[PDB]
């Protein structure tokens, strides 16, 4: 029967490892394993947009961060707190979500399954695959690629307020470095990015009508959703993605993205602002796979005859990050 319960996590955390995900997982999670059973001739409706697993992962990562990444100062709901804010070792590890006795996880194995509606190739699993709880905006990093075709998913495409979650099927490497102070940069392939955009443009045309597709930058909100923001080595990187999202689609070299490491950030855990300590000294570098994207679509008046769809990098709600990995699973009570 469909059911909400308290899922527990499993991981490969090491007790002699001071890295903060390891320390957290050592107390919060069982050691990772795997068993998978195929359920014949069963068809089951899914809805990734209403999946309590997402809320649970959210609570866990909020708790992980709260214990691990202490801002020096936090302002929430007009109330101010200050506290010790030591630098930490920070590198996400894979986390699995598992059902306790009496419950099962159903998994949808349909190819290019969009996350809602009926699934005809269904299995049960003891745990999900291992998910790195990567916190970022605009770009989804270090996730899982689609096996077959590029996929776009939305709770309701006709509602432009609903974020569109893109799952790439071939990764795009992004190399980000702050050299030997708040200035940093990212590199990516101009050609790889163009191929990726081309595959997205194709899937979006399938969805909305082969209307002209345009990409434009984020514009209007918090630095967290205007820039590509992410955490590398404990530092909050904010990367200008204008060059990535400036494109028109109708009928070579490296891209270099300027970044800033910020101390004062708007929090994703809760409405408020937080200040962390300045960057550690020395080279700070992350090489990550872009495995997905978060987009929003512009709305309002457009041409009836030849509509053109405008897309911008989005994100902000990290629940969408988790659903981008959790979309094939649901929990049922047996």
């Amino acid at each position, epitope marked *: 029967k469909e059911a909400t319960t308290t899922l527990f996590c499993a991981s490969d955390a090491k007790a002699y490892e001071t890295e903060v995900h390891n320390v957290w997982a050592t107390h919060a999670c069982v050691p990772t394993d795997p068993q998978e059973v195929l359920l014949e001739n069963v068809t089951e409706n899914f809805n990734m947009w209403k999946n309590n697993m997402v809320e649970q992962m959210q609570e866990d990562i909020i708790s992980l961060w709260d214990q691990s990444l202490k801002p020096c100062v936090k302002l929430t709901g007009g109330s101010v707190i200050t506290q010790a804010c030591p630098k930490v070792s920070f590198e996400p590890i894979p986390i699995h979500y598992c059902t306790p006795a009496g419950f099962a996880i159903l998994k949808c194995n349909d190819r290019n399954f969009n996350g809602t509606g009926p699934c005809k190739n269904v299995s049960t699993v003891q745990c999900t695959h291992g998910i790195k709880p990567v916190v970022s905006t605009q770009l989804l990093l270090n996730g899982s690629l689609a096996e077959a075709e590029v996929v776009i998913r939305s709770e309701n495409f*006709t*509602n*432009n*307020a*609903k*974020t569109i979650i893109i799952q790439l099927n071939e990764t795009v490497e992004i190399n980000c470095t702050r050299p030997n102070i708040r200035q940093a940069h990212c590199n990516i392939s101009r050609a790889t990015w163009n191929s990726t955009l081309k595959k997205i443009v194709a899937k979006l045309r399938e969805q909305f009508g082969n209307k002209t597709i345009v990409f*434009q930058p*984020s*514009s*209007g*909100g918090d630095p967290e*959703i*205007v820039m590509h923001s992410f955490n590398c080595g404990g530092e909050f990187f904010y990367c200008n993605t204008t060059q990535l999202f400036n494109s028109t689609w109708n009928s070579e070299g490296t891209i270099t993205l300027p970044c800033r490491i910020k101390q004062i950030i708007n929090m994703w855990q809760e409405v408020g602002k937080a200040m962390y300590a300045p960057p550690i000294e020395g080279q700070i570098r992350c090489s990550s796979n872009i495995t997905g994207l978060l987009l*929003t*679509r*512009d*709305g*309002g*008046n*457009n*041409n*009836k005859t030849n509509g053109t769809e405008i897309f*911008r*990098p*989005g*994100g*902000g*709600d990290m629940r969408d990050n988790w659903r981008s990995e959790l979309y094939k699973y649901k929990v049922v009570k047996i």
Partner: antibody
Amino acid sequence: MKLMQSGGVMVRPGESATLSCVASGFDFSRNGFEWLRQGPGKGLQWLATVTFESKTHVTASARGRFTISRDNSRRTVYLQMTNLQPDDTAMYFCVKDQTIFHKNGAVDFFSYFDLWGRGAPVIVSA
Amino acid sequence: VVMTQSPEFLAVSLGERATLECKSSHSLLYAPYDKDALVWYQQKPGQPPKLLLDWASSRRSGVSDRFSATSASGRYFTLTISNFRADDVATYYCQQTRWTPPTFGGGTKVDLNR
């Protein structure tokens, strides 16, 4: 909230003219502005839009003849008219449209106008 | 996108009710807001037009409650002026703002019966 217009203008056929509009009392940074045309014994007609990102649309009957632009530092909006003709004789309105910003970053645009300039007569004649 | 109003001229008596009609060739329903993207302006002679109502039925702030409006099928719209008085004599324009470009109703001139 005020839009103070600048006109009007008198001009021989074929000549060019410029109209301006200056915004105060709100946030120029986050609004688009448009130019509307009213004929004598008329009659309302949209001419051009500039969005808050300085994207510009012009009606096709005037495309490559009219041009809209925007100076954010001075909170000013402009209409450049070229090769003006006696037909073009009318009252020109500066107007603020609607720009709606969402939490996830989406932006809706709606071209209706809560805010109107005083209107500026452009008369074209030999 | 064609907007048609009717009648062209409308005479109303000094306490009665004006009923102005506006017809769109297309649906102006804006699905994500579940609102019709249609708007009503008042224009007196010499003045810029004033925005009375937006999304078909919503009075603007400051606008008299004697003004109200109606939408059906995302295509047919009615503007109503109760307690018609001297200062309601004007041209009323409807405007669609669902599609680009925005297009104007062509106007209804309301004057005082007598």
